[PDB]
């Protein structure tokens, strides 16, 4: 489950940040687990139900006078400011970051990945507010790609002198 | 560049066997932002998704032949391939590839197609379309293109022409819209769950079938309507 520089983000691509890496989707497609990203439904209704609608969220039936369909979060995940985050990250701030599951402490603890250029700072309640630095470990071996630092995050990206085609994603 | 995909395919196979075939994408890079597409049509019938992959790995697949089809891509020679298994005389058809565009905007886009390869067996729609349609020169026709909550009213919209022994081309895109090189006699629009294709001015050029489509949220991918063979009289 731990997402590596190995894992294959599927119809996505890797980031990392300060800590941790992970999927993110191409187009507007949401993730449905943390490797896979899939198209997504406009509108919950009955033929919809369990269909993605939004990162790590699903259609689902809310019943009642009247009956409702929504777009609610998967397991393990609860609704903050409309986003699915951890349900040990409730109400965590991190500052120049996010708040993450650490499998390295296996035992459901929430932790802070700091945008690349900051790092956990251990005076501030391990929040992001340490100017530090990151080593990219990503591959990035599609042709004329390498890593970038890109808003905060680093990502594979055109080589300098290059441009990203819109439509294909290929780097001309 | 130039994208241009061409299949190669066994021309008969025997009940049972496991149809293989295999698309070669030129002039461009598989390794992009796009579905590539197995689409099928038997001898005179309409187009059935098969399926398709995102050069990642992932595969969408048509539900009613999951059990019995695989998809594969292969980046380093810029080819993906079509295996269907345990074949029946039900799926002898002309089998095409094709590259469908990726997200709300794109899906169920369908550009450039292949020519397509016949695929015969030896021996041993969820849109409604109405079946035909036909007009004299100069006349103005309209194709209907019924739909449900799940494709047409939440999905973009497309249609396809496809002239007798010729592969299926894009018609109209995102609704109402022209590519270049189609004139303005052709328009569309769609209205709920209902859409339309008129084309004025009538000629014998247009005698073709033509295909809606759209991609579907509940089946989880592109559904074709059964088509309409537009006949021109004298």
């Known amino acids: 489950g731990k997402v590596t520089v190995d894992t294959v983000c599927k119809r996505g691509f890797l980031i990392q940040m300060s800590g941790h890496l992970e999927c993110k989707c191409e187009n507007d497609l949401v993730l449905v687990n943390e490797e896979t990203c899939e198209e997504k439904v406009l509108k919950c209704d009955e033929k919809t139900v369990n269909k993605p609608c939004g990162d790590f969220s699903k259609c689902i039936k809310i019943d009642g006078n009247p009956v409702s369909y929504a777009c609610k979060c998967n397991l393990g995940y609860d609704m903050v400011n409309n986003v699915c985050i951890p349900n040990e990250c409730k109400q965590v701030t991190c500052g120049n970051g996010k708040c993450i599951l650490d499998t390295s402490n296996p035992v459901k603890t929430g932790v802070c990945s700091c945008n690349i250029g900051k790092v956990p700072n251990v005076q501030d309640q391990n929040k992001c507010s340490k100017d530090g630095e990151t080593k990219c470990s990503l591959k990035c071996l599609k042709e004329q790609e390498t890593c970038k630092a890109v808003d905060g995050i680093y990502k594979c990206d055109c080589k300098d002198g290059f441009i990203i085609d819109q439509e294909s994603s290929i780097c001309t | 560049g130039q994208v241009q995909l061409q299949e190669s395919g066994p021309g008969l196979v025997k009940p049972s066997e496991t149809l293989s075939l295999t698309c070669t994408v030129s002039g461009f890079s598989i390794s992009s932002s796009y579905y590539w597409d197995w689409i099928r049509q038997p001898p005179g019938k309409g187009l059935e998704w098969i399926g398709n992959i995102h050069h990642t790995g992932a595969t969408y697949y048509n539900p009613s032949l999951k059990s019995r089809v695989t998809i594969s891509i292969d980046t380093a020679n810029n080819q993906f391939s079509l295996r269907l298994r345990s074949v029946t005389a039900a799926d002898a058809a002309v089998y095409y590839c094709?590259?469908?565009?990726?997200?709300?905007?794109?899906?169920?886009?369908?550009?450039?197609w292949g020519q397509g390869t016949l695929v015969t067996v030896s021996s041993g729609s969820v849109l409604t379309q109405p079946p035909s349609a036909s007009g004299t020169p100069g006349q103005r026709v309209t194709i209907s293109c019924s739909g449900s909550?799940?494709?047409?009213?939440?999905?973009?919209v497309y249609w396809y022409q496809q002239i007798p022994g010729t592969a299926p081309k894009l018609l109209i895109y995102?609704?109402?819209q022209r590519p270049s090189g189609v004139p303005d006699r052709f328009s569309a629009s769609k209205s709920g769950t209902s859409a339309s294709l008129a084309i004025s001015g009538l000629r014998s050029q247009d005698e073709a079938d033509y295909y809606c489509?759209?991609?579907?949220?509940?089946?989880?991918?592109?559904?074709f309507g059964g088509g309409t063979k537009l006949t021109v009289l004298g």
């Open positions: 995102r609704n109402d």
């Open positions: 909550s799940s494709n047409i009213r939440v999905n973009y």
């Open positions: 094709a590259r469908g565009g990726m997200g709300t905007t794109k899906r169920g886009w369908f550009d450039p």
């Open positions: 489509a759209a991609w579907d949220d509940s089946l989880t991918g592109p559904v």
